[PDB]
Amino acid sequence: FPNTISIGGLFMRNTVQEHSAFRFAVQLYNTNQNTTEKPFHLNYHVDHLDSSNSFSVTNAFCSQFSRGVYAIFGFYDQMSMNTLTSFCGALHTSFVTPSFPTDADVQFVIQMRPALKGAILSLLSYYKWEKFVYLYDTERGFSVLQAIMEAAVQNNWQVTARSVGNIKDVQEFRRIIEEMDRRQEKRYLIDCEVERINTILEQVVILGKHSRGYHYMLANLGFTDILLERVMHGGANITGFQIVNNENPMVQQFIQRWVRLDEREFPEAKNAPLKYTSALTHDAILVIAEAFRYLRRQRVDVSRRGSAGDCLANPAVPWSQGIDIERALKMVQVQGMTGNIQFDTYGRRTNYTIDVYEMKGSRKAGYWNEYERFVPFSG
Amino acid sequence: NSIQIGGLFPRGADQEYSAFRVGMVQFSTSEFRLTPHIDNLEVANSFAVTNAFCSQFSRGVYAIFGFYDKKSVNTITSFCGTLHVSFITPSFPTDGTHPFVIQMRPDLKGALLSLIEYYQWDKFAYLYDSDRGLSTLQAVLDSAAEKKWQVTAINVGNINNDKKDETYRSLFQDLELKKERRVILDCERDKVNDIVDQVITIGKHVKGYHYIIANLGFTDGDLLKIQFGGANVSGFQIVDYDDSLVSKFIERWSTLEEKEYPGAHTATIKYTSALTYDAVQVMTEAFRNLRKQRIEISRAGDCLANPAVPWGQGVEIERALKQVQVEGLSGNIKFDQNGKRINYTINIMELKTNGPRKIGYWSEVDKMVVT
Numbered sequence A: 001f002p003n004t005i006s007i008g009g010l011f012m013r014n015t016v017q018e019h020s021a022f023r024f025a026v027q028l029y030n031t032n033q034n035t036t037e038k039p040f041h042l043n044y045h046v047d048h049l050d051s052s053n054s055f056s057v058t059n060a061f062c063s064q065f066s067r068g069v070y071a072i073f074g075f076y077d078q079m080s081m082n083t084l085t086s087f088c089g090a091l092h093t094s095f096v097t098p099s100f101p102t103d104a105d106v107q108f109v110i111q112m113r114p115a116l117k118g119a120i121l122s123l124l125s126y127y128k129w130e131k132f133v134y135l136y137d138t139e140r141g142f143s144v145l146q147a148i149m150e151a152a153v154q155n156n157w158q159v160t161a162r163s164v165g166n167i168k169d170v171q172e173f174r175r176i177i178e179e180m181d182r183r184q185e186k187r188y189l190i191d192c193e194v195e196r197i198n199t200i201l202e203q204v205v206i207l208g209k210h211s212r213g214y215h216y217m218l219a220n221l222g223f224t225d226i227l228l229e230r231v232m233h234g235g236a237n238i239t240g241f242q243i244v245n246n247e248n249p250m251v252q253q254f255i256q257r258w259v260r261l262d263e264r265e266f267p268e269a270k271n272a273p274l275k276y277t278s279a280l281t282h283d284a285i286l287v288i289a290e291a292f293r294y295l296r297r298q299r300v301d302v303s304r305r306g307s308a309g310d311c312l313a314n315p316a317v318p319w320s321q322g323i324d325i326e327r328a329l330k331m332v333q334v335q336g337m338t339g340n341i342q343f344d345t346y347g348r349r350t351n352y353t354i355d356v357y358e359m360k361g362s363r364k365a366g367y368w369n370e371y372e373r374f375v376p377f378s379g
Numbered sequence B: 001n002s003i004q005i006g007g008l009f010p011r012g013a014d015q016e017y018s019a020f021r022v023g024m025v026q027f028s029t030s031e032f033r034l035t036p037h038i039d040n041l042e043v044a045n046s047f048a049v050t051n052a053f054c055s056q057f058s059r060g061v062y063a064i065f066g067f068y069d070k071k072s073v074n075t076i077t078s079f080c081g082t083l084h085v086s087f088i089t090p091s092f093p094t095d096g097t098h099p100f101v102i103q104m105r106p107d108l109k110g111a112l113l114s115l116i117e118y119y120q121w122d123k124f125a126y127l128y129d130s131d132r133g134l135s136t137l138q139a140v141l142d143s144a145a146e147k148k149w150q151v152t153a154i155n156v157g158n159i160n161n162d163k164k165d166e167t168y169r170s171l172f173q174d175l176e177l178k179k180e181r182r183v184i185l186d187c188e189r190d191k192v193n194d195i196v197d198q199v200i201t202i203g204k205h206v207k208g209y210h211y212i213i214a215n216l217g218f219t220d221g222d223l224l225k226i227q228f229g230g231a232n233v234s235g236f237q238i239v240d241y242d243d244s245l246v247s248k249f250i251e252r253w254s255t256l257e258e259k260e261y262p263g264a265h266t267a268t269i270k271y272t273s274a275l276t277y278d279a280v281q282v283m284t285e286a287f288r289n290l291r292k293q294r295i296e297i298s299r300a301g302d303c304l305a306n307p308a309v310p311w312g313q314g315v316e317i318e319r320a321l322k323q324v325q326v327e328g329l330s331g332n333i334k335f336d337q338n339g340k341r342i343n344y345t346i347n348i349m350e351l352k353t354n355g356p357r358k359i360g361y362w363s364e365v366d367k368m369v370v371t
């Protein structure tokens, strides 16, 4: 077994905090004195993409592949996702990611982020929503939109569905809200990026639709980054979702070290709000460490220096160690900042919990999992 | 002398590649010879598409003709745009304004929305194929929101061949509980034929039902099997068999030897194939135009070079492609600055017991006209 496992790191715009969390998680792994928990040194090579288009991501992937990596940690978006998954699948190189979980059943992609559609559908069921506005962007895929459309057919819902991801001028959000208010619409499912959710809710408050007869369901796991103060005060209902419980030992342990870091070494740690994607990043390093510790114990061949040669070698002959690496990543069960971490055969999170919040401050109202569905607490 | 070009063809796109070859003969000219390098591949596989692109780039092509799908379109747009290599394609037009891509296929959205209004539908089912992409569904749902339509949107992608026949029957049973008799099919030729087969099997091709076939190849479908039941059927056609340009082409095409030209020897041509033939005209005309302007063009190395090295003459090629204006199998061919078809015509068809009938057309300058 090698002395060093080196991984790739593919970071995009707007992953500053995650990048700090990545480096800190690897430093937590490497500074452990217990040699049973730290039997190899973890190394990384990071590439920062000024943009995440297919050309730049292919370029980064290939140089990482050539330098020698045993797996790649990183981020994709709608523009880069297909290229990455296709290259990982052809070359048997495992990508581990906190990005939106993919639409397709794919190989060699470990998807740290749990799917949200099931929790969304259970809560629409619990609140008995049959008529509502659905505002969405496509930055996290089409899973939710497809699920909403399909559930509308099964349950005879009236969904007014409006794509909002291309709206640049805030007066268009105002026009949409005013038209829906004229149709007596009181229920909004917002399936957008956090920053777009913030834009929309500022318009809700400007127009006084943050009062008691309105209910905003926020379909985004970055609930704690959404600006909800002005909305709480008006009296509207708010429903949100999270995957981080700040009372779990793993989280209290991370946070007390994280708040002490020098911001010159770890930008956006210290007092900045911790994004769930940064917890997912930490969790990725737990998964990677566990898998390689597993491979060591079982005396499985992982190769001397990792991947080698040309990503556009023709024919493409995948290294033989790739399949065993993938299986080791996919079989882990660990407790992380985002709770119980396990994966199915397509690298989707399984046997996970989502915590459900409603507004008053904000209180946890219940939890959701795949087997129990939505479980509300007393009250 | 030669102008090397790339041809990226999906595996089994036989009729398209036949039409490409017929175009190469028909449009050959004294000023130059187009010399194609053909890769056949899995167009849904971005890795495969990236290898083919880079391979063409290194041989030193001046443009690439090809196809992409929802999964590989970001590969094509990103590499073409970075390296200033023009892509000409009959595939679904891209969602935004990507450079170095010329889109032979006219946009359908405008005509489809006008045709919904023309029949005064405000309540309908919409069967969409998630394997093909979702931007027409998004448009239809946005219009539904603006105009207060009630749309029952059902995904007919991701259907195992195992139970395709059974799934479609249950889909249409559920529609009859809601008493829904107006259905749009946002699918291409094969899947349209599959669904139509099941509609007939359960007897919903009868009077009192209306189907709109939302693709640019109305008569590419097997329409004869739904022509006698009594249901209304409507669609869109960009290839007009009454135009003399198209009937002249059909005289030769219908008499080609099928063994040498797979998919020929027929009285119709799929719109994809027709747009491919038209692409050979557009490319020929672009390079001839560069010569009329005395803009000299000769000179690519490593696909993944750092830094990216885009050739200077790329912009000139792009510009010449985008300035072309000709008549082809798909009508008047002209492009805006982002390579999208403009100034085009889409014929509106209804099926009758004596065959498909042209009832009008939709134009990109105005909207729906009855003829």
Ligand SMILES: *[C@@H]1O[C@H](CO)[C@@H](O)[C@H](O)[C@H]1NC(C)=O
Binding pocket: A034, A036, A037
């Ligand atoms: C860490 O080392 C201690 C002391 O040797 C040992 O008891 C423990 O099992 C080791 N590994 C763990 C906790 O995973």
Ligand SMILES: *[C@@H]1O[C@H](CO)[C@@H](O)[C@H](O)[C@H]1NC(C)=O
Binding pocket: A186, A187, A212, A213, A214, A215, A237
């Ligand atoms: C707000 O929440 C309550 C439960 O606390 C619910 O019964 C009520 O219907 C909600 N308001 C709207 C407008 O749906």
Ligand SMILES: *[C@@H]1O[C@H](CO)[C@@H](O)[C@H](O)[C@H]1NC(C)=O
Binding pocket: A340, A351
């Ligand atoms: C689910 O996770 C729990 C711990 O949260 C674990 O004990 C249990 O065995 C897991 N269940 C399955 C079916 O994997």
Ligand SMILES: *[C@@H]1O[C@H](CO)[C@@H](O)[C@H](O)[C@H]1NC(C)=O
Binding pocket: B181, B182, B208, B209, B210, B232
């Ligand atoms: C079939 O077409 C006629 C008009 O030609 C129309 O009156 C009828 O409503 C159509 N059928 C359906 C189900 O809409």
Ligand SMILES: *[C@@H]1O[C@H](CO)[C@@H](O)[C@H](O)[C@H]1NC(C)=O
Binding pocket: B331, B332, B334, B343
């Ligand atoms: C548009 O197309 C028509 C019909 O083919 C053609 O004759 C006309 O000159 C074109 N108009 C423009 C503005 O290019």
